[PDB]
Every structure is written in C-alpha cells, then in structure tokens.
C-alpha cells in the first residue's frame, strides 16, 4: 500500500487488471474481504492529487453478463451474485440504451431474482432507500434508465413509487411516452388487487388530463383489465 | 519507494515588522531576504540536480495565512507569493517554526516514512532544509517579549507524540540572521568564515544539525548563500556520542549528517530503536528525532562477508571525521551501539562501525545486522561448511542469536538470507515488534494524517477576505476599507464615478452605449484593459497566438533576443 501511494508518479495499473482475469476462473475469489478492505482504505478522497475515481468496468460487465449463461438452469444462487447484480445497475448505464443488449440486461435482472436471495434483496432495498427517499426530479431520469426500473418489477413498492408520479408527469409534455407506458404497466399489473395497486389507482383517479386520447386509452385499458379479472 | 531525489527547500521568511529596517543598501531587510531567496535559487540552478527541487514558503503570519507555497504549489506561485510578502506582524518565530515543521511532517504518517516501531531506516528519507531568514530582533507576542525560543505544544498533530521533537531525522534548520547596519560598515571585506549568530534561533539550528549565519554585508550574504547551496544534501542527521573512556571535546558529541545516495535510495538494515519491542505494550515509546548513536574508540576489525547486503553511508565533514582521519587507522573500525536496543544491556549490542576510507578522505558508516560479530561468523559458516543446509548446533546458535535479535530486524534479515540463496532458513512470519493495539493506532493515525493533509493542502490558497473594517467604539457597525478585488466598473456602476469626473465619464459611457453599432460593448476602457499586470504586459509570445498566423515565405536581456 505504501509503495502504491508514495510512488504515485508510476502507479501499478495491474490492481484493476487482475480483477477481470481472476473473476473468469474462480468466481468465489471475488467475495473475499481483502479487496473490500483495500478499497475502503484507499477511498479517502483528496482534491489536489489522488486517484479517487473508479476505473472502467467494461471487462467486469462483460464477465458478469457472460456468467448468466452458465447460471440459466441454476435455481439456487448465492447472495454474492445477487449483490453483484444489484451493484451492476448502479453504474453509468453503458449498454442500457442499446436495444441489442436487451437479453444481457434481462439475464442480469433475473439473476438477482432463493435461500439467501431474500436477505440480499432486503439489504439491496435498504441500501437503495437512501436514493428512494430523495425527491429527485422526473427530468433527471434518462431514457436508458427506464429499462432498469422496469426490469426489477417484482417489488411492489417500486411499482407503487413509479405509479405515484403518473399524475406528476400528466402535465409534462416531454413525458407523454412514459405516461403511456405507465398506463400500460398499470393496466397489466392490475391482477393482484393489493394495497399498492389500490393506492396507485386512487392517486391517479383524481388527476384530470386535458387531452382526450390518453384518458380514453387509460379507460379502455382499465375496462379490459377489469374484464380480465373476476375480483375487480 | 521513496523519492529522495526531490529535495524540499522550505523558506521561513520572517515577516515581522522588524524586517522593515533599512540597510545601507537602501532596501529593507525583507527586500534583502527576497533577494537572498532569488540568489539562492540562481546559485542552486547551476547544479543539474536542482531540477525537481520543491520550494516552499512559510511566514510569521497566522496558520491560515502562514503557508504561502506548500505541497502541490508550482514555482510560479512560489515566485508570486515571495514577491508580495509584507512585513507587518509580530516575531512569532516559535509558532511559525512549529507550523513549518508540521508542514514538513504533514504526509509522514500517511506514507509511513517514519517507520515507527520498526527500526529507523536512513533510506526512508524525505530530505528537507528550512532556511529561515530573519533579524536578531527579540521575539514578540501580543502579551510581551519572549527572551528565549520555545516551540508551542498546543494543538498537537496526530501522532506527534511518537517523536519527542517537532523536527525529524531528515530535516535541518538553517538561520540567515541579517545584521546589516544602516551605515556603510567601515570593516573591510574579510574572507574569514561566517560567524555563528547569537540569537535565540541558533540553539534550535544546532540541535537540528544545521547552523545559524550572521550577515552584516552583501559579501557575507553571498558567502552564506554559497555555503547553504553546498549544504543541500540528501541525508539524515545522526547524534553521534562517545561511549567509554578516551582512546568534553568537539568530537565527543556531534549532530553530523550521513549521506544517502539514491540509485530511489536502496538499503537493507535499519538503525536500531531506542527500546526493546514487546507485544503487550499498549503504546509505543517516544522517539528521539536524532538517534543517539554511541561509538567505542577501540579500533576493532571491520569484518565483512562476501555476499552480505551492507549499507554504506558517507559521513559529512565534522570534528569526529577529522579525529578519525587524523589518527590514520583505515584498517580498523570503531564499533557502534544504540543504547537500550537490547533485551537487558544498557549499551546494547553493536550494529555497525565507523571505518575510514582507504584514501583517508572520508569516514563511512557501515550499517550491519544487529549484534553482527555473533551473526556474521554463523552466516559465513552457513554457506561455507554445509552450503545453506543448517545443522542442529548451527540452528540452535542461530535461535540463541534470535533471542537477542529485535523483531523489527526480521524482515531485512529474511530478505538478506533470501538473496544469499537460503530462503527457507527462518519461519516466514510477521514481525512481532508491534502489538495489535499499536498497529491499529498506527492505521488510525494514518487515516487522521490523510484527512489533516487534505485539509492543510487545500487551505494554502488563502481563500479568505481580510477584515476590512474599523470596529466603531460606543464611547457591530464598522467603517469599511478599500480592497484589491473591487475594481471600479465605472460603466456598470454609477457609484464609482467621482464628482469631478462625472460629466466627461457620462459622455464616455453614453458613447460606449450608443456608438456600439458595429463596434464592441465592453466595460470601462483604460481600466479593465491597459491595467494589465506587469508580468503579462509584454508577453508577446502569448499575445501572438490570439492573432492569426502570417503566411510562410520560404546586459542579460532587453525584452527579446
């Protein structure tokens, strides 16, 4: 550590390089706390001269996406894989916008979906609650981030939070496509009759939209969903 | 591992108002000090090794503004800060010296250069010298006058308790005391040596391994600057002491410097600690900044085996070197000890020796393993009798030596025996010098030092505004004062226009507004432009870039070639 820090004019670039090679041979090796301890020790942010940023993880992302092929038929998975899949979505969204990479994103999302997966999901939700509680702007969400939110649709709380902003984006002309996707998702998800769905329906009921096409489409979708379920 | 090829030149310029005294030259003491720094760098630049020199500036101001050029401040910033120093404070020599040493020791704990509790490594050095330029005027505070120099202890640095002095092994303090009179001194320009000054800074200078210079003539100034340029060396100050009877003298005690030569200095054996390590001590004993090294004037034999890694450090000229080269015994050596380094012995076992060179031109310190007269025969017999195939008696004797062998030498000894060709001689285990509590404390100190270094380095910019106010007494409200940053935007602000200049300037701004048709709508001409800093006044090299290039066709200086 002292050699890496003091001799920063010629630092060792193999620290990040060795991660890609080792992860493709021994997946359990990446779960050790030594790398975590090193990252925590080196995480002191200095403004004048320091390497306080994270290097490109394209090789790591490729390895993670290719590991889904070997875990397609595996029903039981460890919590380390779930944590890695959760952490993968928190990147820069390099391949989120690419439509050809839809299969890889779907596989990554399904990987996190269960002996230890419940605890991993609970920990992921607790960690993400810090960002969830923040009142982020609707315009701050990029177009490529829609797939990330839609993929993790298992949690009813996330769906309820997404549906809660349907009335907020009703007056926004730039969110008409998301509003239509929200209506489609609300119609499709109206099959459990749970608390979250009822809350979303009550929130969206009192919102009046000036255009008639969107309201008519929402009413038609609601009628179709009601005809689909006998518990309507 | 550690860059000793980039020396730090910290300048502690006295900015007390007493430095406004005028010499016979017509310039102030502060002007002489700035010229002395400039001359020092002009002389230093003649040496090709001068590249990579870190120049730092600390003053007698308060800690937020004491540091003008610290770490990660470029040369142009150093020059600009030096040029604009003003002598308007009190002679807070002790406080400013404390801040200077804290600045030098800012990153020591982050990078572990001190090697606390693990032996003192002469090759773990960040060689710096503090050249403090001052006058002999008495030290002052708000309360009164201090007749003696005392470095404050309040607000201790994290881990400052580990070394019982503020200055460090690889740091030397030099004082340039200006005693230039206001009258043209009748003394001739005698070529004698520079006197030691008698001010309160001289004891601290001598303790650090430096010296004070008394200056009362420009010729003397040049002489001290030349000697100071000659004293910029990469090395560590060793407190050499005499043990035993003679074989109260200058060579009995000396704070001499041993040279360390890079190429990235390479070395193996540390200087022993002043205590025996144990795994149950909650706290590490404090260190002397200069290790008390004791030699015995016995003229022993300098035993060496062929393949051993031995560190050789050339002593600087000193009365001890004079004594050794005058007795003229280059084939014999004086054994060297560190007191209390052993389990029980007060004097301890030897770790090295002073051996004069063959030409009797220099004396070199040969840093050997701990208790080397016992180890070296065994280490030779390891490779001479059984070819690194240890016997029962040899292993028993080696373990017995290990009982007297401090654990902090285990790493260097392991590396040494490995590079001889016997890697499996000893158990590959962590050094038992430090307890878990000690190592946890050291890591906590490293983190705290990192945070404090980040705070201090970001604080050197002096990004604050002086209290431009006159606190009005009753018998809150204050009267403002002019500032440097309130450049009058007389076109953009009608309050900056004097009454006497009201009409013509009104005409000017009217013309600037209406006549801007196919023109330019700038601020006030003759102010925002044509009041450029003098440094950028005639920068034609930079100016020509903003102009389109032309068409191709094929005593020192006077503003051009």
Q: What is the secondary structure of B366-407 as a DSSP string?
A: EEPPTTHHHHHHHHHHHHHTSSS---HHHHHHHHHHHHSS-G
State the best of A5, A38, A40, A50 to mutate against chain B, taking most chain B CBs within 10 Å.
A5
Contact call for A48 and B112, based on CB within 8 A = no
Q: Does B5 touch chain A (CB under 8 A)?
A: no
CA dist., res. A165 & res. A153, Å (int): 16
Q: Which residue of B has its CA nearest to A46?
A: B454
CB atoms closer than 10 angstroms to residue B101: 26
Of B387, B393, B459, B395, the residue nearest B421 (C-alpha): B387
Contact call for A44 and B112, based on CB within 8 A = no
CA dist., res. A158 & res. B221, Å (int): 77
CA B65 from chain center: how many Å? Answer: 19
Helices B372-384 & B410-420, crossing angle to 10 degrees?
30
Contact call for A49 and B110, based on CB within 8 A = no
Alpha-carbon distances, residue B38 vs B46, B96, B132, B135, B561 (angstroms): 13, 21, 14, 18, 23
CB atoms closer than 10 angstroms to residue A8: 12
Q: Which residue has the tokens 């890591």?
A: B443
Q: What is the 3-state secondary structure (H, E, C) of B185-244?
A: CCCCCCCCCCCCCCCCCHHHHHHHCCCEEEECCHHHHHHHHHHHHHCCCCEEEEEEEEEC
Contact call for A48 and B71, based on CB within 8 A = yes
Helices A156-164 & A176-189, crossing angle to 10 degrees?
140
CA dist., res. B77 & res. B83, Å (int): 10
State the best of A6, A9, A37, A42 to mutate against chain B, taking most chain B CBs within 10 Å.
A6
DSSP state of B138: P
Our CA angle for B240, B241, B244, nearest 5°, is 145
Contact call for A47 and B458, based on CB within 8 A = yes
Alpha carbon of B70: minimum distance to chain A alpha carbons (Å): 12
Q: Does B112 touch chain A (CB under 8 A)?
A: yes
Confirm if B338 and B271 have CB atoms less than 8 A apart.
yes
Resolution of this PDB entry, in A? Answer: 3.1
B171-190 per-residue burial string, b: 16 or more CB within 10 A, e: under 16 = bbbbbbbbbbeeeeeeeeee
Of A55, A58, A70, A56, the residue nearest A25 (C-alpha): A70
CA dist., res. A139 & res. B510, Å (int): 45
Q: Which residue of B has its CA nearest to A50?
A: B454
Of B6, B69, B67, B12, the residue nearest B36 (C-alpha): B12
Of B515, B517, B550, B449, the residue nearest B105 (C-alpha): B449
Alpha carbon of A7: minimum distance to chain B alpha carbons (Å): 6
Confirm if B373 and B305 have CB atoms less than 8 A apart.
no
Confirm if B235 and B259 have CB atoms less than 8 A apart.
yes
CA dist., res. B399 & res. B405, Å (int): 9
Of B62, B44, B60, the residue nearest B52 (C-alpha): B44
Helix (H, G, I), strand (E, B) or coil at B40: helix
CB atoms closer than 10 angstroms to residue B35: 15
Q: Which residue has the tokens 């007297």?
A: B404
Of B87, B213, B62, the residue nearest B141 (C-alpha): B62
Helix (H, G, I), strand (E, B) or coil at B364: strand
Run of H or E residues at B94: helix B93-104
Q: How close are the terminal C-alpha atoms of chain A, in Å?
A: 63
Nearest 10 degrees: CA dihedral of B79, B84, B88, B92?
A: -10
Residues of B with CB below 8 A from A46's CB? 450, 453-454, 457
Helix (H, G, I), strand (E, B) or coil at B435: coil
Structure tokens at B227: 């000697």
Run of H or E residues at B145: strand B145-146
Confirm if B103 and B452 have CB atoms less than 8 A apart.
no
Residues of A with CB below 8 A from B451's CB? 44
Residue in A7, A44, A46 nearest the CB of B1? A7
Of B158, B129, B164, the residue nearest B291 (C-alpha): B164
CA dist., res. A70 & res. A73, Å (int): 8
Q: After which residue numbers is chain A interrupted with C–N beyond 2.5 angstroms? A: 113
Of B169, B55, B79, the residue nearest B122 (C-alpha): B169
Alpha carbon of A3: minimum distance to chain B alpha carbons (Å): 6
CA dist., res. B8 & res. B4, Å (int): 9
Beta pairing, strands B363-367 & B292-296: unpaired
CB atoms closer than 10 angstroms to residue B347: 15
CA B362 from chain center: how many Å? Answer: 25
Our CA angle for A59, A62, A66, nearest 5°, is 140
CA dist., res. B442 & res. B284, Å (int): 10
Backbone phi and psi for residue B66, each to the nearest 5 degrees, phi listed first: -65, -40
């Amino acid at each position: 550590v002292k050699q890496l820090k003091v001799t920063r004019a010629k630092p060792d670039s193999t620290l990040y390089l060795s991660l890609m090679y080792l992860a493709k041979i021994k997946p359990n090796i990446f779960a050790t706390e030594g790398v975590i301890e090193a990252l925590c020790s080196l995480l002191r942010r200095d403004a004048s001269i320091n390497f306080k940023a994270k290097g490109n993880s394209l090789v790591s992302v490729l390895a993670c996406n290719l590991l889904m092929a070997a875990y397609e038929e595996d029903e039981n998975w460890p919590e380390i894989f779930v944590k890695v899949y959760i952490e993968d979505s928190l990147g820069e969204r390099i391949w989120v916008d690419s439509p050809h990479c839809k299969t890889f994103v779907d596989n990554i999302q399904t990987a996190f979906n269960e002996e230890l997966a419940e605890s991993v999901e609970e920990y992921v939700l607790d960690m993400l609650r810090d960002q969830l509680n923040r009142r982020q702007p609707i315009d701050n969400v990029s177009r490529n981030l829609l797939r990330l939110l839609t993929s993790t649709c298992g949690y009813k709380e996330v769906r309820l939070l997404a549906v809660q902003k349907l009335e907020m984006w009703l007056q926004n002309p730039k969110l008409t496509r998301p509003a239509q996707d929200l209506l489609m998702s609300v119609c499709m998800n109206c099959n459990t009759h749970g608390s979250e769905d009822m809350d979303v329906i009550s929130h969206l009921i009192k919102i009046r939209l000036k255009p008639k096409v969107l309201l008519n489409h929402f009413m038609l979708c609601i009628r179709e969903l009601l005809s689909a379920h006998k518990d309507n | 591992y550690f860059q000793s090829n980039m020396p730090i030149l910290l300048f502690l310029i006295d900015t007390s108002a007493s430095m406004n005294q005028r010499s016979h030259l017509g310039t102030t003491y502060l002007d002489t000090a700035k010229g002395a720094v400039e001359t020092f760098m002009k002389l230093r630049a003649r040496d090709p090794a001068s590249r990579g020199d870190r120049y730092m500036l600390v003053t007698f101001e308060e800690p937020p503004y004491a540091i003008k050029a610290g770490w990660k401040e470029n040369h142009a910033t150093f020059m600009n800060e030096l040029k604009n120093l003003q002598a308007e404070g009190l002679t807070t020599l002790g406080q400013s010296l404390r801040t200077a040493f804290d600045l030098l020791n800012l990153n020591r704990l982050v990078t572990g250069i001190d090697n606390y509790g693990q032996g003192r490594n002469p090759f773990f050095l960040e060689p710096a010298i503090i050249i403090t330029i001052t006058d002999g005027s008495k030290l002052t505070t708000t309360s009164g006058v201090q007749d003696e120099l005392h470095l404050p202890l309040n607000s201790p640095l994290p881990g400052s308790e580990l070394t019982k002095e503020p200055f460090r092994w690889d740091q030397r303090l030099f004082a340039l005391v200006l005693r230039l009179p206001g009258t043209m001194s009748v003394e001739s320009e005698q070529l004698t040596g520079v006197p030691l000054d008698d001010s309160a800074i001289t004891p601290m200078c001598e303790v650090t391994g430096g010296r004070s210079y008394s200056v009362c003539s420009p010729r003397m100034l040049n002489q001290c600057l030349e000697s100071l340029v000659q004293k910029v060396q990469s090395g560590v100050v060793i407190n050499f002491e005499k043990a035993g009877p003679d074989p109260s003298q200058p060579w009995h005690s000396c704070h001499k410097l041993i040279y360390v030569r890079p190429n990235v200095p390479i070395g193996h054996w540390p200087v022993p600690e002043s205590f025996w390590p144990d795994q149950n001590s909650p706290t590490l004993p404090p260190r002397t900044s200069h290790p008390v090294v004791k030699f015995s004037c016995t003229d022993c034999e300098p035993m060496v085996i062929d393949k051993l890694p031995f560190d050789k450090y050339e002593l600087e000229p000193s009365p001890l070197t004079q004594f050794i080269l005058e007795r003229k015994s280059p084939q014999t050596c004086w054994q060297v000890y560190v007191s209390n380094s052993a389990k029980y012995s007060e004097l301890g076992h030897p770790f090295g020796y002073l051996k004069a060179s063959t030409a009797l031109n220099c004396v070199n310190l040969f840093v050997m393993p701990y208790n080397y007269p016992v180890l070296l025969p065994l280490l030779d017999d390891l490779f001479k009798v059984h070819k690194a195939k240890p016997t029962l008696k040899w292993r028993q004797s080696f373990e017995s030596y290990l009982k007297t062998m401090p654990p902090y030498y285990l790493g260097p000894l392991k590396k040494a025996v490995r590079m001889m060709g016997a890697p499996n001689l000893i158990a590959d285990s962590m050094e038992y010098g430090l307890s878990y509590s000690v190592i946890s404390y050291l890591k906590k100190l490293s983190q705290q030092a990192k945070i404090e270094s980040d705070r201090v380095i970001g604080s050197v910019g002096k990004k604050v505004v002086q209290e431009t106010g006159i606190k009005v007494r009753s018998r809150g409200f204050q009267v403002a004062l002019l500032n440097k940053d309130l450049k009058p935007q007389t076109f953009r602000n009608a309050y900056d226009i004097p009454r006497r200049n009201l009409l013509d300037h009104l005409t000017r701004m009217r013309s600037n507004l209406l006549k801007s048709t196919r023109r330019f709508l700038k601020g006030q001409d003759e102010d925002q432009v044509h009041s450029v800093p003098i440094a950028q006044m005639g920068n034609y090299q930079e100016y020509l870039k903003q102009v389109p290039s032309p068409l191709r066709e094929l005593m020192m200086i006077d503003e051009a070639d």
